[PDB]
Amino acid sequence: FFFPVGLYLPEDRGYTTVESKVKLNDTVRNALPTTAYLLNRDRAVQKIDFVDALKTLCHPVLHEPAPCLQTFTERGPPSEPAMQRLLECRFQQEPMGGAARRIPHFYRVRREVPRTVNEMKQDFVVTDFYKVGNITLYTELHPFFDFTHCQENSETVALCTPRIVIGNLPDGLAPGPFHELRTWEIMEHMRLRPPP
Amino acid sequence: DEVARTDEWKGAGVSRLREVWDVQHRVRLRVLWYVNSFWRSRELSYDDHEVELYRALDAYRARIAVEYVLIRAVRDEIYAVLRRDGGALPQRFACHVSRNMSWRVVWELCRHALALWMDWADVRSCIIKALTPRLSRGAAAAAQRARRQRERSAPKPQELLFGPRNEPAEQTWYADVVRCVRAQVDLGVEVRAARCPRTGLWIVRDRRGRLRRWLSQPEVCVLYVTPDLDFYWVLPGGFAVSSRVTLHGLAQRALRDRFQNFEAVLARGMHVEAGRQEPETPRVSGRRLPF
Amino acid sequence: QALTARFFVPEGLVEFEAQPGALLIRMETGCDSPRHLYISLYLLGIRASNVSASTRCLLESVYTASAARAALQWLDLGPHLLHRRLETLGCVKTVLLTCVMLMIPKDMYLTWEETRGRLQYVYLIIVYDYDGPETRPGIYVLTSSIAHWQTLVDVARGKFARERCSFVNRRITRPRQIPLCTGVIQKLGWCLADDIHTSFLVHKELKLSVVRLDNFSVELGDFREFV
Amino acid sequence: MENWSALELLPKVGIPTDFLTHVKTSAGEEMFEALRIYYGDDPERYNIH
Amino acid sequence: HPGFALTAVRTDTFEVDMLLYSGKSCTSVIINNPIVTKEERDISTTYHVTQNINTVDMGLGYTSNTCVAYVNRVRTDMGVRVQDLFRVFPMNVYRHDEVDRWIRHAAGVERPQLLDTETISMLTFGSMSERNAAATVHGQKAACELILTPVTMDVNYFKIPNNPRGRASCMLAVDPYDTEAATKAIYDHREADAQTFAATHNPWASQAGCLSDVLYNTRHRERLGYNSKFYSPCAQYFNTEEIIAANKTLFKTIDEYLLRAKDCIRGDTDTQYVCVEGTEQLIENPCRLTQEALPILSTTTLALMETKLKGGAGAFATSETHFGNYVVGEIIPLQQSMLFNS
Amino acid sequence: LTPVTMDVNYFKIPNNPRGRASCMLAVDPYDTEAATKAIYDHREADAQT
Amino acid sequence: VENATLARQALNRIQRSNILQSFKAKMLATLFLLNRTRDRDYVLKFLTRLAEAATDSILDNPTTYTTSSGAKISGVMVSTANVMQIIMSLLSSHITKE
Amino acid sequence: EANIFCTFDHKLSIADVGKLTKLVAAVVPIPQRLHLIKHYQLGLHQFVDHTRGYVRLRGLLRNMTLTLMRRVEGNQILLHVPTHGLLYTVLNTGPVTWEKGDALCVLPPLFHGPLARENLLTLGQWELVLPWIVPMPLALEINQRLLIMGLFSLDRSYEEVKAAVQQLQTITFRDATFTIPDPVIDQHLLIDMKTACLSMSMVANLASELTMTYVRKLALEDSSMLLVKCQELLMRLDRERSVGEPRTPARPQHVSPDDEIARLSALFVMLRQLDDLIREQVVFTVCDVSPDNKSATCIF
Amino acid sequence: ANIFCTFDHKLSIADVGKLTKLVAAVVPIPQRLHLIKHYQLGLHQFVDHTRGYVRLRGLLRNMTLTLMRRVEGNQILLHVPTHGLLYTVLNTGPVTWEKGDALCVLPPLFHGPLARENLLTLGQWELVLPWIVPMPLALEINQRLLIMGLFSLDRSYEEVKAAVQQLQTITFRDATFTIPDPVIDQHLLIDMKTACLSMSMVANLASELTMTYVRKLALEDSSMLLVKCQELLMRLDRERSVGEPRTPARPQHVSPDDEIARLSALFVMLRQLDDLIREQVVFTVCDVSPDNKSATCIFKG
Amino acid sequence: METHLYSDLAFEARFADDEQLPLHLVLDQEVLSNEEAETLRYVYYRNVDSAGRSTGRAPGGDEDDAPASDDAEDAVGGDRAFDRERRTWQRACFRVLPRPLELLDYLRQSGLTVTLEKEQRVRMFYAVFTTLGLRCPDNRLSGAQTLHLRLVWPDGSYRDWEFLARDLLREEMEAN
């Protein structure tokens, strides 16, 4: 058996089939899914939350991308040669003090920049992000770590980095209004739902 | 009952602890001064005369300067060989060309590229990684083996009929890639090299096996260096400045101790038998138990 | 199959001894007229340092006898010289008693595994601490699934590093005192994984926390010393 | 590796067969082992050593 | 609410009575007279009598079928108690020691327990670090989760039975003895998986290198220190190499299904411990052959569970949705049947 | 009773009014210490809810 | 009687857990079945389940307590007159005076 | 308890049971000491790993249980553990001669040099590898030789240890040459070196002052051939220690019989502690050897 | 499992009567045949002038021992013991026994005594029987004869003569012996010579190799034990070199063929000591007869 | 900490041979990476005089001062330069503590008496402990000597840091 907890429905396709049977209060503590309820061996309700789930959610192995980075370099680059126009990415060490003056010299050239992978991930709308039309799904591996390929010394080397806050999650994995509903949840936790 | 040295060494403790630096101000590390060291009881004398520290600074200057003056030797080697031929370099690398294309601008890009490479040389460059395997013992042994191998006479039919049979497929070069439009050079390029069957020109490839395709890009330029320490400098179009790297102006022992490939001693985790498959490294963990 | 040993035991040691699960050990006394005494291992408990002081107080309050007094004197002569004096004879069958050629105190019993191995050999381990005044002999009884003697000595060195460095500290601090060994491994037999029951014991109207071993097959082992 | 000459040569008791599926599907999907599926007529059963 | 949705999964056992059907004389049995081997103890003697049995199948196809028809007792608890991940990785700690101590104080587990050597695991077969609880009234329990996206469209994916990884991994579709095409079927995201026509449903579970690929692939669990004695419900899904090795023809697939694809769990303890040399029981697993999990009744609010339970029979097959709340319904009325026979 | 405890799953089902399970059939026979830490130790959850 | 659970066998926690589950389920489900329903065949199969649930005696004289027409008595059940009259009016096809 | 039944997931043909029926009274290792066992953990095939450590296989094998192979009958094996003390018979395939009088040990097998790699049992990927039964002096010889390999080779480049072990890995024992396959260093081997260094430090410490100069006395008194070799070794060690002349010894002051008894008894304790690294306990004591050197009757 | 041992020589019935008093005692035989000539029975085949005691201990270590069971008109019924089974052994050893003792077997020291084995002999054959001595007495008498062997070189002085005069006299419960000196005619026997020289040279190579080898392992991960090992060797060097000339110049560089020869030589010279290092127990007693003439002992080995 | 006692004892042991005084060092995240620290095999050191280029070569110059002649057969002096360079380096004792600590507090957890003039609370993520030995030729030592430091990993790569010995002894040696 398997079941989701905390799964977020969209708002643009919002609907309700059961409105005569039930009606809930307008507070988002009932209008944001954060807990679930199942049935026991006997026909009795039970509540599953994150509070029981922290016995798993705070383990160190969920924050270890080193086997993930290892098997990502074993996967290596994308094989298709026309899909290598996305990996261009430079991590070099530059004198900051002269460059702080010299930033007009960067725009002295007339060549554009290649778009990075994380910028190539934000453009996808919420529903087609799981389709094959996306290209950067092979970069998305972990909710806590962004993964990418970069050209360092003319070598396509893989690199992961911790998404430091939850706002670094991509738009296809967490949309905009989801965060606004999270704010309404945190205002109702702080009891400020009428704002000053 | 004599007190064992560990007890009063434990109760002795530390006088003071301070940090120090390297010469180039890149590394800070901390020294520890136990009061119970015999260095305290050795009462040894100390002096620092100024000409001695001046000799230390000149020795350190040469020890830094070895690879940079090697780079300068490479650069005026290029200058001398472009003055030698008159400036009409031939082609050594297999790539087609177009007649209806102005080569003055790629010549200017070559000048700017060698300029930017001189600004952006490094102790870790192509020629240093090229000549580091030359410093090994097996380099001298295989040099003797190749000098008897290629300089071996044509065989008589007797060993063609009854003698055992004979066997140098592709080369392992290193390269600098200087990109002028982005002002970024490259220092460590590993590249495989081979010859075409139809023509004697070179073909370069990735160490995985992918064909290296930068030679088509006109703004870029490249420097190749071989394990036998030859020298190519290729602007786009496959045309190559070709020479050898000169190092007779450098001392033997300074190059030998400044950088050298290292032969390993036996420690925990490796086979006593040579060339066996290595098991996993010890890898003391900050994540697991020490056990 | 059992090898019988009949014993004439005086009444100065019959405290805590009427139960079957008892081990008599023939130690060479300092006095020469008996030349040896069949001490109990629970008397090796009270001398030991690894045990609790509450069980030591129990062993004092149950063994106020001149026989246990003089036996404690004759074992208190030689500093760490017990393995050159102590020599086992096997477990008591029934008490003047019979012996074959099983109860144990909770504190001196120990294990280094999760005791889920089916076959489990049992061993006696003395250790000689020297960071006390002269010598702290710690007695230990160990059940373990290991069978080969030398890897048991290696895991004992892995578990008794404090005793080893205390031994070499005694060697480097007292040159005129020459110690023989840190201790002795000696097996006594083996049990299955199921008969080990942590239970209670009441003897001479006195209370005790015991661990019983039912299907104990006995096999005499040599006093194989170890550092 | 069974002696298929011993199958083709020896007298065999006849049966009304019943495979559940089609028999060539059962051969191509290995319900059994050592499936000799020669087409036509292979005369290799004739020579005896 | 944090920025993800956890999809939990569990294996729940049932004690069932299955019937069997055979034709007339399907298997010819070949028996002999019993042979006695004598052994002598100290007081008694033990005679081991032994009869050999040969069985010869007298059928081309399948002369015998079976069907699970009735369930009478449910040996598990249908609970939501979460799998103790610290009990299965007893060596991995955080790098800074004080924040690790604060985490263990924040959770229920207390200490990093030292694992054993190769010799101790050779002699002693099992660890079983977590001990039997006090009250075991409900029975044994398990629940393990996957950190998946909150964007994941449930109506396609959670209402029907599916593989919980995001990609269909039943090797009946792929050609047999074709490991390359099978790996391209279960790992490649340049093509669509066959169940739902998208690239995947969750990138944190599907492709190799995700959290699930390093958490539940037992080949990948060998890299870190893990306890094998616990049971994973995810172990029948992210075990990629055994799934590739399972790719045979369908008759051989049926053979290994009814011969080797049956799990074994110790039924005495509340934790799902993986049994070994288990001839005392065998837990047959159809979900391994489907490589798909089963949707269970879940809800969001207590009021919507109230209008489900208060409502008439057959309500659990339906699945309604509010504005932000939802009910997924179990596809078979197992709650209905299992409570109605009582 | 504390006025916060859930009625929706505790009061609909036949339960012990004490709060914990205390049925004493899920305990081992003749195990008094496991029994009393099942009854009164609130460091462990009851087997009912 | 639904599972082979004779007193010589030992039980684990899963055993007693499911036994207590069925205990509560059948304590609630059938408390006063003569007020739950007056169904004929339902109380017939209930009485059969009650009858075969008891184990046999050790000694049983087969000559004793046989009826006419060779039928042999397995056991004897007893209620008060009210329940007896309800059963007599309910299951009269399976009752015989002999 | 005693008779241990094993099985096979795969069928045996007539060839498999034919090569199994010549394996009667061969000793196989079992790790579990259980009754209804399975054939994948039978033998050393689950434990064999090249480039992993011979000393690991050695330690696990001396920790493993041993049993005797008798009476296959088709998908059955009937392993029987030998009881301690009673006479049994053995049948070895290890190409090493035996003797009616010596003792035996059990070692992980080496490659002899013909490199057959067929121990007459293979089930698919799974194969059977048999532990070599080796007479006691060859057993302690290979133990001490791997100990010298582990003790010497630390902090050395590959060429000097290669020149050492091309002549150190070879052992010619009774017209048979053997080489050790995997001499790779181990943490367990490091703790053997630890016990070795502590034991030789202790016998360096509490040895008597006369025994530290005894070979000098016997050198000044008598000249024998082994004494000439001993003087060569000791004076080369002295000139590697000190270029000065080693002085003659005089009347020893501290003569005390109880002192010599105590310090040499502790010395014997420490030599036992050092020798129990390499001195393996016996496993078989020969009552009779077959003339074709295939089988034997051994009392254990 | 019984052995027959016949005599080629004429025996009297009085020879049987002086033979049958050794009814249940241990004899050594070199290897087990079903029928064996009596010239292999007993240690008479090995004992001579110029071998010594340690040869007898080493060849006794692998000589298979056999209890005697019965005497017949010409042949002797021997019975080989088995492990764990009880038997009856008579104490022909020179030391009394007590219950619970651990017994080892060592060669006798009164070769050609005043008893002459109670006059049981033959033409150029005296039947000699090994002593069955308790284990602690066995190990201490081995140590005593070994340190007698150390002082056998320096017998010039008189305080060493008083020390070895203490060494001959042994003490035990109602037992005193004069242990025979292994040096005879101002020379040592060859076995004691090689045993003691090998022991002393093992001590020497240990004292001059332990520093470089504890350094070689201490370049790895370190503990307190190797630290105190190095400190102990520093104590030895600071009490050792107080009169030796300074700057001995021990090098950290040394060619490999030296130290592999050093290690193998140390190992073989300690390897030839384990006949006398380990005391392999062979018996323990479960009941002692009165006047300790015999004992029901359980066989070990 | 444990190499410091042993290295002090060993440099006291070998002080008659080489006259090297020991030098206990600790290093942190400011020099090497944690990935470089979790698998660091060993460390090398060599004391170089202000005028003498080694202590393993000959003191009054060396025959390797003649330049490399661009030869194919013997590349740079043959193998004699190579094993002279193997002689010019020396190994040091070495430990790694990967979990973070504070050496004031951590050396208070061990039994030492941490007696510093002021408690500057210095924190580090991983503490690697070693001890080199710098060679005073006679009893007298010069400040213009330098001490090199190799860090060698199992792949074969190395990192090279050197510093002149006066900077270690600015206020330490003038205090005496």
Residue numbers in the entry:
A (entry chain a): 393 to 588
B (entry chain M): 298 to 464, 468 to 591
C (entry chain g): 44 to 138, 145 to 150, 165 to 290
D (entry chain B): 1 to 49
E (entry chain a): 1029 to 1370
F (entry chain B): 1176 to 1224
G (entry chain B): 197 to 294
H (entry chain h): 5 to 304
Task: List passages from the publication reporting this PDB structure.
We present the in situ structures of the symmetry-mismatched portal and the capsid vertex-specific components (CVSCs) of HCMV. In this study, we show that the portal of HCMV is composed of a 12-fold symmetric (C12) main body, a 5-fold symmetric (C5) 10-helix anchor, and a 6-fold symmetric (C6) turret, and is specifically adapted to pack its large genome. The main functions of the herpesvirus capsid are to package, transport, and deliver the viral genome.
Using the same data processing strategy for that of the HCMV intact virion, we sequentially resolved the structures of the C5 portal vertex, the C12 portal, the C1 portal vertex, the C6 portal vertex and the C1 capsid of the partially-enveloped HCMV nucleocapsid at resolutions of 3.9 Å, 4.2 Å, 4.8 Å, 5.3 Å, and 6.3 Å, respectively. Compared with the intact virion, the portal vertex of the partially-enveloped nucleocapsid underwent substantial conformational changes. Second, while the portal vertex, including the triplexes, the MCPs, pp150 and the CVSCs, expanded outward and away from the symmetric axis using the portal-distal end of MCP floor region as a pivot point, the portal moved upwards about 1.9 Å. In addition, MCP and Ta showed some local structural changes in the partially-enveloped capsid. The trunk loop (aa 136–146) of Ta, Tri1, and part of the long helix of the P6 MCP Johnson-fold—involved in interactions with the portal turret and wing of the intact virion, respectively—became flexible. Our investigations with the partially-enveloped capsid showed that the portal and its surrounding capsid proteins undergo conformational changes once the virion envelope is ruptured. On the one hand, the outwards movement of the portal vertex would alleviate the inner capsid pressure to facilitate genome retention during nucleocapsid trafficking. On the other hand, the disassociation of the portal turret with the MCP N-latch and the subsequent structural disorder likely prime the nucleocapsid for genome ejection.
